[PDB]
Design a protein around this ligand. Structure first.
Ligand SMILES: Nc1ncnc2c1ncn2[C@@H]1O[C@H](/C=C/CNC(=O)c2cc([N+](=O)[O-])cc(O)c2O)[C@@H](O)[C@H]1O
Ligand SMILES: [Mg+2]
Length: 212
């Protein structure tokens, strides 16, 4: 019994089917009063929701799905036609995520890509019918943030105005990524201080908008 599939079941036993909102609340309560998990959470989630609404992106790239929590948070707010692509290298995780989405009825807007970002990213354009991303949400291995950003930029997936939202910029932390993005003239950055999911520890999200 996986701690991951543990949650997947809880949602199936407590979430109002086809109701993204309910799913999110099920996942959060479980991780709050029982086992802890690396879900962005509701605090940072609300910032996500706010940023997403502002930019109302057409094409959004998620790096690291885990249990699909943020994939649901993001997809439930997508306008008709908008598609969300989420890369997950762990087959067990990409599995739970897919169900998580199917249960929220959000499955028609999300295309899950099982594999490692560094490998999948350069295949993105031709194999998935993609030109440029409108938004990118980074939440996978912390040492992968910078390399994938340089990778994303090399494959011409970044466009003037593309929005990069990054989680855990303070904890666990992503020094190199932050340093690179805030010092680069190709990125206009803004910080949004919040709290690490399920507990009161300072951590924030970083928005880095690509300028060209
Ligand atoms: N190169 C790659 N391509 C595709 N998928 C990949 C990938 N590298 C990792 N993944 C997947 O993304 C998730 C990684 C989460 C790391 N976050 C964390 O380690 C983390 C830790 C805390 N924390 O300590 O509180 C809080 C957080 O919000 C966190 O996201 C895992 O499900 C992993 O399988
Ligand atoms: Mg995270």
């Amino acid at each position: 019994d996986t701690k991951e599939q543990r949650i997947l079941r809880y949602v199936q036993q407590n979430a109002k089917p086809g109701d993204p909102q309910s799913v999110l609340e099920a996942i959060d309560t479980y991780c709050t009063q029982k086992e802890w998990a690396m879900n962005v959470g509701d605090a940072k989630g609300q910032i996500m929701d706010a940023v997403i609404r502002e930019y109302s992106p057409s094409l959004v790239l998620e790096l690291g799905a885990y249990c699909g929590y943020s994939a649901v948070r993001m997809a439930r707010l997508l306008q008709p036609g908008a598609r969300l692509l989420t890369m997950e290298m762990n087959p067990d995780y990409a599995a739970i995520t897919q169900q998580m989405l199917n249960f929220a009825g959000l499955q028609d807007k999300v295309t899950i890509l099982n594999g490692a970002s560094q490998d999948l990213i350069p295949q993105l354009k031709k194999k998935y019918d993609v030109d440029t991303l409108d938004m990118v949400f980074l939440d996978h291995w912390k040492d992968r943030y910078l390399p994938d950003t340089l990778l994303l930029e090399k494959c011409g997936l970044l466009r003037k105005g593309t929005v990069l939202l990054a989680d855990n910029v303070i904890v666990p932390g992503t020094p190199d990524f932050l340093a690179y993005v805030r010092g680069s003239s190709s990125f206009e950055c803004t910080h949004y201080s919040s709290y690490l999911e399920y507990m009161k520890v300072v951590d924030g999200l970083e928005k880095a908008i690509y300028q060209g």
